[PDB]
């Protein structure tokens, strides 16, 4: 019986473990939908024209808009698991449990990221509205630090710019950068010394607001090979892949997804050549959902 | 019952949602009518010599003038809506319910935007009469931040010339501009020192007073009455749209009335398989005494 | 709600007539339940056995290609209705009520059956195939349909035609035993001088009206008075632009099994069939547009799946 | 990594050669790659005081 309760404790440790490894939890959508193997959303758009008189009828006005609806759904399953070999599994476990929990937990998000990531750039890569931006001619020439904050930021101006005219508010948004170029390398941003209180990071792993959006990041970007994010391909009509690419721009409510049954862990004994096995599962995943606009930056 | 309750929370939600993307509520003039179709606004009297050394009275020379309230009324019911296919109902709330509130509200403002814009375009385009300023250089000579930040400010001076030399209550006034411009001017302000986050203004969702005026940058600048030869490059009328960004005003140079808060309801049609919503708003758009208006020019 | 009480009865009379009308009610995959906006149907396969030796492995038997089974969702609104006035519903009940039911039903049903043909058609234009190695050409006419007239002519080459339609059902493995065969009412008279020219067997060999033809050697015979027409999963009745409009229009210059080169479409059981939305509902309203009190009955359904294998038929040329 | 123990004077813990998470239809099961692996985890113990 007790060996059964222990599992509940492990599950609590996990879910809680998905955070702090949390990359993107907020800053995009999600829903509790039960038994729906799929789910959908609106598209439409913001636009307006002249107005009614007691004469005629409103009906005609809606011709051009081409209202649109869009649906996505779960794909395969999503998880790894771990094969314990524990007597200790019952007890003594303060160190061991932590180790085990981390190893799946961070992994789950580490899959989760790219699935919600690269496909955005894809949405920018078909021919979202469109966007891109750069500085002069290469990263070859431009190397040295503090310039590496400069050209970037200088781009960020235009970043805030095209955030308009397609509308959407600036109220909240975030850019997921790459940890190398990360922070502007904080120099150009902060040629100040001892104040990160001034840069407002009350934990949460987040640099406070810059002009436009907000700047955080996790390592790199990849998932979908483990879609199309041709880091290898320079152009081939599609430039928004990695190599090049840049720390990212996210535009309010461009994505999210549906998860059914939340997270469930299954515990087993598979005895072929064995110790013992546990199983946790997640059914959701996605790329998708018809963003309004978006973009990235490259060097060329 | 349940549906009505949902609709009721709705109205609230989008009510509070309206003023957000709304470019103007205050910083302008309005009234709440009671049952009236119309109204009228006194421009009134401001100059008074008040030298009373007894003789005559207020005289016929003072009787000869306009000072006539341009009356005003609705242009007809001004409201818009969008059709939906209902699934969410009383579930899937917060997110995805808010999407419709959104889709309607910003539009409900969006027209009003060009409206108060439209009056300004109308105001000095026909042939006092507050006015413009031109270039310092042609559109082709307009390239980067450094340049196009400054000439705005260069304009600002003689822009104030009208604000002042023409009298007017120098207390409170606003300037309207576009993000392409907004960028430029602010870029003229502080290329140095990080980000505009440093500007301590945004809590009021505004711009604390810059030289003269006050700053509210526009989203759009295209609606109707636009009614003015926006499309035309010039065709005289140098006041037109898409020559430039320089439109500006001051308080009580326009404004209008409305009807008894804001309400709405829905119903199906089923011609095609749906249940759709209708908001209803009065507003209208009042013109008024000309002053504080004009622009820069690219020519 | 007297109308609601009667509305249900009308729905019952509708669905009945409907099922009566169409070719597809059974003989295809039907899966649906509450709130499912999608569904997936396992392609699988079966050979195996119940046999084994202690040792080896059970699991060893698997190593199989694909169970992914293509989860698919609904195609959107599908609706056919009419305009009408109160009295037949208000009492009336009788003949008029019963009659209208069909009046909507057959048209909707006729569209529904053709939807499967449309969806099936796109994936097989001139094959795809290659368990289930291949299909078989149904080939030869022994003389052209131009010259084919009487029922003792076709019937002789009809039994000769489906001979290899008794072939592809073998080479694909599968329970080829209980199956179906579709044709045209132009050939309605053909089986007569084929099946049993001695008298017409009714009280002896049985074979009365079964709602279809009691099984001949292989297959079976039912009929669908038109072919290329129909469509589903959309705002429906219209000139065209439907997906199914399969390339029947091109008979030769390749494009062999394309319709109107053919008669005898031979296919098997459970190659297709789809989802549907939560039983069926409908309702009325007032319009007054032109004195209008009218009804609406809408559908969702869904569409087909499985492997790229489509039928075949007899030929010319 | 740092373990703990009570009077063990020795211990064993796992290694990191294979893991991820992934996605599949119920077509197949994993662990072939896992069969290809060498060892799994090895133990360790005290050295002196």
UniProtKB/Swiss-Prot annotation, chain A:
It comes from the Viruses. Keywords: Capsid protein, Virion. InterPro entries: Capsid_Gp10A/Gp10B-like_dom (IPR049301), Capsid_Gp10A/Gp10B_dom (IPR039009). One of its GO terms (cellular component) is viral capsid. Its main location: virion. The N-terminus interacts with an internal region of the major capsid protein subunit in an adjacent capsomere (intercapsomeric interactions) to stabilize the capsid. Belongs to the T7virus major capsid protein family. This is Major capsid protein.
From Swiss-Prot, chain C:
Pfam families: Gp10A-like. GO terms for biological process: viral translational frameshifting. Coiled coil: none annotated. Its main location: virion. It is found in: Virion. The keyword Membrane does not apply. The keyword Hydrolase does not apply. InterPro entries: Capsid_Gp10A/Gp10B-like_dom, Capsid_Gp10A/Gp10B_dom. One of its GO terms (molecular function) is identical protein binding. Signal peptide: none annotated. Keywords: Capsid protein, Virion. Assembles with the minor capsid protein to form an icosahedral capsid with a T=7 symmetry, about 60 nm in diameter, and consisting of 415 capsid proteins. The major and minor capsid proteins are incorporated into the capsid in about a 90/10 ratio respectively. Once the capsid is formed, encapsidates one single copy of the viral genome. The N-terminus interacts with an internal region of the major capsid protein subunit in an adjacent capsomere (intercapsomeric interactions) to stabilize the capsid. HAMAP family: CAPSID_PROTEIN_T7 (MF_04119). Belongs to the T7virus major capsid protein family. Homohexamer. Interacts with the connector protein and the minor capsid protein. Interacts with the capsid assembly scaffolding protein; capsid proteins and scaffolding proteins form building blocks that assemble to form the procapsid, each hexamer of the major capsid protein interacting with 2 scaffolding proteins. This is Major capsid protein. The lineage of its organism: Viruses, Duplodnaviria, Heunggongvirae, Uroviricota, Caudoviricetes.
From Swiss-Prot, chain D:
Transmembrane segments: none annotated. It is found in: Virion. The N-terminus interacts with an internal region of the major capsid protein subunit in an adjacent capsomere (intercapsomeric interactions) to stabilize the capsid. Assembles with the minor capsid protein to form an icosahedral capsid with a T=7 symmetry, about 60 nm in diameter, and consisting of 415 capsid proteins. The major and minor capsid proteins are incorporated into the capsid in about a 90/10 ratio respectively. Once the capsid is formed, encapsidates one single copy of the viral genome. Belongs to the T7virus major capsid protein family. Homohexamer. Interacts with the connector protein and the minor capsid protein. Interacts with the capsid assembly scaffolding protein; capsid proteins and scaffolding proteins form building blocks that assemble to form the procapsid, each hexamer of the major capsid protein interacting with 2 scaffolding proteins. This is Major capsid protein. It comes from Escherichia phage T7 (Bacteriophage T7).
């Amino acid at each position: 019986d007790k060996l059964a309760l222990f599992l509940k404790v492990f599950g609590g440790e996990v879910l809680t473990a998905f955070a702090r490894t949390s990359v993107t939890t907020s800053r995009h959508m999600v829903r509790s939908i039960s038994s729906g193997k799929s789910a959908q959303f609106p598209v439409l758009g913001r636009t307006q024209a002249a107005y009614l008189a007691p004469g005629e009828n409103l009906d005609d006005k809606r011709k051009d808009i081409k209202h649109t609806e869009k649906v996505i759904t779960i794909d395969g399953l999503l998880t790894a698991d771990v094969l314990i070999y524990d007597i200790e599994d019952a007890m003594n476990h303060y160190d061991v449990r932590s180790e085990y929990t981390s190893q799946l937990g961070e992994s789950l998000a580490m899959a989760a990221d790219g699935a919600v990531l690269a496909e955005i750039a894809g949405l920018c890569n078909v021919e979202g509205t469109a966007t891109v931006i750069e500085t002069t001619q290469n990263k070859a020439a431009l190397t040295d630090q503090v310039a590496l904050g400069k050209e970037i930021i200088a781009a960020l101006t235009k970043a805030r710019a095209a955030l308009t005219k397609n509308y959407v508010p600036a109220a909240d948004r975030v850019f997921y950068c790459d940890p190398d170029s990360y922070s502007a390398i904080l120099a150009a941003l902060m040629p100040n010394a001892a104040n990160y209180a001034a840069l407002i990071d009350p934990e949460k792993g987040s640099i406070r607001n810059v002009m436009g959006f907000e700047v955080v990041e996790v390592p790199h970007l990849t998932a979908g090979g483990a879609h199309v994010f041709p880091a290898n391909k320079g152009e081939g009509n599609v430039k928004v892949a990695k190599d090049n690419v840049i720390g990212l721009f996210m535009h309010r409510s461009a994505v999210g997804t549906v998860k059914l049954r939340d997270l469930a862990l299954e515990r087993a004994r598979r005895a072929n050549f064995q110790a013992d096995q546990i199983i946790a599962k997640y059914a959701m995943g996605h790329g998708g959902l018809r963003p309004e606009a978006a973009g990235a930056v490259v060097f060329k």
